[PDB]
Design a binder for this molecule. Structure first.
Ligand SMILES: [Mg+2]
Ligand SMILES: [Mg+2]
Lengths: 627, 622
């Protein structure tokens, strides 16, 4: 890593949006003693590279605007063009901030097609880890605009946030998108924020020891069983089951949607094939076709008339296959789906779209299919030992994808994470404030705005009160409002029972934009939160609940009675309660609870009808009054 | 008794057993002389002080009709009496199942049935905890013609029709069967005396005070409906109801699998469908599969059908005038008290009218009417007489021990999978008990090995159903018995499979060989005899190979497993070599045990003989 000439950090490149209204640092590397001259804003700026091969130029604050160029000269020449000054938002978290407009392009087709915001730009950070400590540079990437060429790669949440802020504030908006699916808050926290967790602390130190890491990976590889040979009859028989000439023998009836565990196939992991013959009118031939096959657990190959038209390797993507003209023929067509399933309930997720579309016509793909098992996997032990997976390691993502930008000026942080911490949801009460204060320390921005997303509803619904790990995670977010300069978007009405990646990203980004408009952009009278539990008092057989953020008043979303309220006495055995808005408060009681002491609202993974709002249509946070 | 009284089985249209000395018995006042006029001759006996009389008649050849005129203080005349073969057809619900509940598959058999000399005497469900009853409940002998065919047990009818077509004598069916019942309830006291825990129950149940003390304990020691769909001012089937708060559901399926966790209670389902004019002003037929547990089905606010429990197939006939042109509203209220509520998959869901059909699978809307709170389900409960040892034997078998019969058909066991190991002893004990009580130590007893049922598995495993089938297989040691294999006739999703015809006709093969002397008839599929170990092979020998072993589908032999000493079975290669199957697995270098079709529902049990009868499942480990 000897620098022989000027090198700029990857974030300092063409089209960047730099932070307006703050002293700016322009830093980089070069050969020792190399004389750097920067031509910028009608002036020349000079510095000498140190013996550490690093250089730094300090520039005075700039107001929003542009475009500018910068010309750097030393032993080489570097020219940067199309530089703007505006507000740079660091947008971070796991897969629901990762999720890009291109995978929500049915619902947001019109937003994608009309996006013409050349001064909203995203710098997307590839997934990167460093077990040794903070990295000095992000991976190579580019600043891409919210226009035709780059809109599809924007984080959907970040785009709808940025679009709302831009329309009202009218300054360039930069998005540093640093997000990785399936990751924990510990992986995103710098070492100093985790030092009080003794077991995590020891892992951090072990991971800096290459010998120790290599030992664990060796014992993982040594014990790693060899690759398994496929026993798939559908591929290994003389005629493959997608071959147009195959004659089904031994196939049974199946119904889409559904899981095969629920259709007569017990404890089965492996490969199951599905076959359906459908009649296609001539009007859907010789044109492109579009297949929506819901969501499949775990992986599928989809063949039409023997031709592979689509594949998805894992359970999370929605199946959306574009079929070229000429595959479908008039009359009888053979659809064959090979479903591979390595763990849990394989099959076709219900409450999802299953259809084939062409020429503004649609054919239903739900209903009767035929199935035959191609392979059943024999059970085996699967608990380890495992190699050290870097993105699961504490600090590893912070080090490589956050630490390199600490010198880059930023306006604030948007954070949407927690799905991967529901197993230590109680601990998250400490983990979230620790991350906030860690990033503030490392950025040297003790005032840095940090706005986060409370987890949405997800999972099976229940019709009796019960305990909930998701609810505990939502409480950790609620209680973190004690940290100065924070805000929380409630999303309990935006999720889906059957998907951890819900489609409605627009309302997430726009609810975060309300927080920013009030707290970062000084819109002092803007209602930016739904009702937030403040306090409660017991009066006889009733509990009276007071709230902050009532806007112009409390209401129910549907005009029906308040739902999802519970009440309990000293024994904490909760029952569904009667709840009624009176003035600015909610009165809770149950004829079954004589001496009530505690109230819960929307305390579940997926409350059926959380209908407490303010008149400004923002949902109340779930809460409990017991501790 | 001050007037002559005949047992309920001795009545008009009765089929009496041919070719045996016959007993005709009854009651009258003490000392009353009873005179029977029959077959051109008079018979006389005197009623004893115990109010009972008996007349012994000589054997009769098959035929009829005859009359019997009894004269005591009053006269009784019976007419339309036939002599033929009387089969006592017994067991639980798959013997109960009547042609009327299989009238889609057997519509034409029902329509064309014209056998006035095949007659069924159906016994209503009855129990007696005190001991053997002396009379059956009132019933009648009904013929297999249009007026009585629908009430025939389907298994018994298909047996009787096959026997009649070849043997050409009147066939009587004494149908004594009760759903959900155990073999112990069907066994007389003497057959259970060696099961000490059962014996103690038999004696307790004879003590009416002791039973009442338990029942009155239950009447003290053991919830209000909150169904919004019935209790809101506008009920959810009212045509004017406006759905608010309804969500999407997909039929077939269980709600546990569509987002409603741990939910017992009442869930309502709503679908609006477009009806073409050709389907209006004519009768309509709704098949709504099978529903767990109970349902009420409304169309345009009018209740068109209901079923109170999970077992019946839903088949509702809707009169002309309910359906209208255009938009029609279907509303189903489903109640579920235990287990997974909803709509059973792999069932028909459709509306038919005027040769057209509309799919009822697909997207419905749902809303929960009520969710039952958890509560203790263990009672205590009153003593249920149908569940008590001897209680069904006492009231539905014991009263006919003096009636001449040809043989017994038995189809039971589903309710004994919980003590399947004990069934190895219970089945021979019932056979020997009935033989003793009927004073027929040679009585033919032909039974049904349980069919396949339940979820399929793709790895070897244990199975209580398989143990129940082994009990049947091993009971073939008892003389004058025979077993029908049904491992290919059941259904994965129903304990009441539709194919009753093959059950009855496989039993008829057993009777034709063993009761009607058809010497060279192949009447059984291959039956495991023995096996030997030769290196890494186990060679299995079979009886009843007919004209040879084969596979049903022409593919490799399926469902064979092999294990070594540790009894860890793996799927094995199996090949037919004569009257033998050579079993081996490359993984098992020291094999000791073989299993075939050892599962609740073997995927492809394909070992047959050339005459198309299935081999019995078996294991060689014990
Ligand atoms: Mg599976
Ligand atoms: Mg249930």
């Amino acid at each position: 890593g000897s620098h022989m000439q000027i090198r700029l950090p990857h974030i300092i490149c063409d089209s960047m949006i730099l932070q307006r209204d703050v002293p700016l640092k322009i830093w980089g590397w070069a050969s020792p003693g190399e004389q750097i001259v920067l031509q910028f804003n009608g002036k020349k700026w000079s510095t000498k590279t140190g013996a550490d091969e690093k250089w730094l130029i300090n520039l005075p604050a700039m107001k929003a605007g542009g475009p500018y160029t910068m010309e750097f000269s030393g032993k080489n020449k570097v020219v940067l063009k199309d530089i703007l000054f505006g507000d740079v938002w660091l947008c971070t978290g796991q897969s629901n901030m990762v999720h890009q407009l291109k995978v929500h392009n049915i619902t947001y087709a019109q937003d994608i097609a009309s996006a013409n915001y050349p001064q909203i730009r995203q710098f997307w950070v590839p997934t990167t880890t460093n077990l040794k400590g903070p990295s000095e540079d992000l991976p190579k990437s580019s600043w891409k605009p919210a226009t035709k060429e780059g809109i599809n790669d924007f984080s959907a949440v970040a785009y709808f946030f940025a679009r709302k802020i831009y329309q009202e504030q009218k300054i360039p908006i930069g998005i540093i998108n640093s997000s990785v699916g399936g990751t924990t808050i510990e992986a995103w926290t710098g070492e100093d924020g985790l030092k009080d967790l003794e077991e995590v602390r020891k892992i951090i130190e072990r991971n800096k020891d290459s010998a120790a890491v290599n030992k664990i990976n060796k014992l993982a590889d040594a014990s790693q069983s060899p690759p398994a040979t496929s026993a798939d009859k559908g591929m290994l028989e003389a005629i493959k089951w997608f071959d147009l000439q195959y004659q089904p023998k031994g196939w049974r009836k199946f119904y889409v949607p559904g899981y095969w565990e629920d259709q007569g196939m017990r404890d089965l992991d492996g490969v199951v094939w599905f076959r359906k013959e459908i009649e296609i009118p001539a009007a859907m031939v010789a044109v492109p076709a579009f297949i929506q096959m819901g969501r499949i657990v775990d992986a599928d190959r989809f063949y039409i008339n023997g031709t592979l038209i689509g594949s998805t390797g894992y359970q999370y993507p929605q199946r959306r296959y574009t079929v070229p003209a000429g595959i479908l023929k008039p009359g009888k067509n053979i659809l064959v789906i090979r479903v591979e399933n390595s763990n849990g309930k394989g099959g076709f997720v219900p409450d999802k779209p299953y259809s084939l579309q062409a020429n503004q016509q649609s054919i239903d793909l739900k209903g009767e299919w035929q199935y035959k098992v191609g392979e059943a996997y024999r059970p085996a032990f699967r608990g380890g030992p495992f190699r050290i997976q870097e993105q699961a390691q504490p600090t590893a993502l912070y080090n490589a994808m956050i630490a390199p930008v600490v010198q880059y000026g930023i306006k604030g942080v948007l954070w949407y994470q927690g799905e991967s911490n529901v197993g230590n949801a109680l601990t998250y009460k400490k983990l979230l404030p620790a991350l906030i204060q860690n990033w503030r320390a490392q950025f040297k921005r003790r005032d840095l705005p940090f706005y986060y997303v409370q987890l949405p509803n997800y999972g099976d619904m229940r019709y009796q009160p019960g305990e909930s790990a998701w609810a505990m995670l939502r409480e950790a977010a609620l209680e973190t409002l004690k940290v100065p300069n924070t805000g929380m978007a409630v999303t309990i009405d935006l999720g889906e029972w059957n998907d951890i990646h819900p489609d409605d990203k627009k309302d997430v980004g726009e609810r975060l934009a309300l927080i920013a408009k009030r707290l970062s952009y000084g819109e002092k009278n803007l209602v930016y939160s739904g009702p937030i539990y403040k306090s409660s008092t017991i009066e006889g057989n009733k509990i009276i609940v007071s709230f902050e953020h009532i806007g112009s008043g409390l209401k129910t979303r549907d005009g029906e009675s308040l739902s999802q309220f519970e009440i309990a006495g000293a024994d904490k055995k909760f029952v569904w309660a009667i709840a009624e808005i009176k003035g600015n408060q909610v009165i809770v009681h149950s004829p079954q609870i004589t001496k009530p002491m505690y109230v819960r609202y929307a305390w579940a993974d997926n409350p059926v009808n959380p209908n407490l709002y303010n008149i400004e249509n923002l949902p109340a946070s779930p809460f409990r009054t017991d501790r």
